[PDB]
């Protein structure tokens, strides 16, 4: 599947994509305002996230350090990145069909549309200005909006016994994007599209 | 090697070890207060860590939750854990010797004592109220006093580029711990022992 992000921030943005135990294409790449990078995600791909990186410095080597969504100090991610990060998560072909969201659960750090660039289904967007409005416990210094269970690390926030319910902190991301998950068990936003479609990743949409 | 682990605060904490690719012997333990738990460490095992974790909740499998020191919600830790924590960091057998020290690299959540229980070499310790006189940027929600890398993300705080100094957040851990490491950088405080030594690790040594 091919999938092209786009930044239309006004900043640069350090693209990551990763299935949480190897890269997907080249994992990341720097993106300035306006720039596209296309990549090719192999089909079968299940637990796939794309994100942005904010206020990245990286050397030579592709060794450094970003504020938002760091995943261990590299530019090609590996590894799924810190918190706060705003997730566009997917998985393909599975029985058939391919499987998109937007997910607010790791927080979030820059406004995102998801859409898919062949017919058969909808797109989900969440570009609210959710860091403007963030409830102050969960303002992240380096920028971003934390989760509250990355900030809390309770059962309730975290959903760890596999029962919860949703939260003052919840329904504050909730309010702001309904298409985007608010925590573990909110009622599922998942947008079903054909199998072996195509997408786009859009940062910044508004403009 | 021997490591005895004792716990010696008031309230429970959760012991965990790991080389972080793999545990350290059962890699984790519940510690009543009072209770000591005996580990046995391969010797040749180099970057090696134990720390404490507290206030968790874990299910009948060993999956759960810590506010401190959280090792991806297990109960016997494969991997390092998530700050704050106060670190007993070893390297064992390398080249005749062992090395030893306590870090504040990754803040601190519990005070400590890390000494050896064979002759040879002398031990450390950071027993000093952290958590009570903890920088408000730094204090962690659920406990701990964060280390500024981990709160900032910066390079200087990271010492990402290899380059860095001491920092106004440095300082204070050390003005408090002069014999654990205050930042990447730091004079090492790094103790030198006879090759195959034992050693005792004690929380809330102070009692």
Known sequence: ATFEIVNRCSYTVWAAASK?????????????????WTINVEPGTKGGKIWARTDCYF??????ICKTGDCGGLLRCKRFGRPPTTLAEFSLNQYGKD???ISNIKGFNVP?????????????????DIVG???AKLKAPGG???????????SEYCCTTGKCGPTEYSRFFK??????FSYVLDKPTT???????????????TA
Chains 1, 2 share one sequence.
């Open 59 to 64: 050397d030579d080597s592709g060794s450094g």
């Open 191 to 205: 947008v079903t599209c054909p199998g072996s479609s195509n997408y786009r990743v859009t940062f910044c949409p």
């Open 20 to 36: 949480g135990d190897a890269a997907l294409d080249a994992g990341g790449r720097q993106l300035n305002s306006g720039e596209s």
């Open 144 to 154: 971003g909006c934390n989760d509250a269970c990355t900030v809390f690390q309770t």
């Open 99 to 101: 499987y998109i969201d």
């Open 133 to 135: 409005q963030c409830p």
């Open 112 to 128: 995102m549309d998801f859409s898919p660039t062949t017919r058969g289904c909808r797109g989900v967007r969440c570009a609210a």
């Open 175 to 180: 309010r702001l994007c309904p298409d985007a």
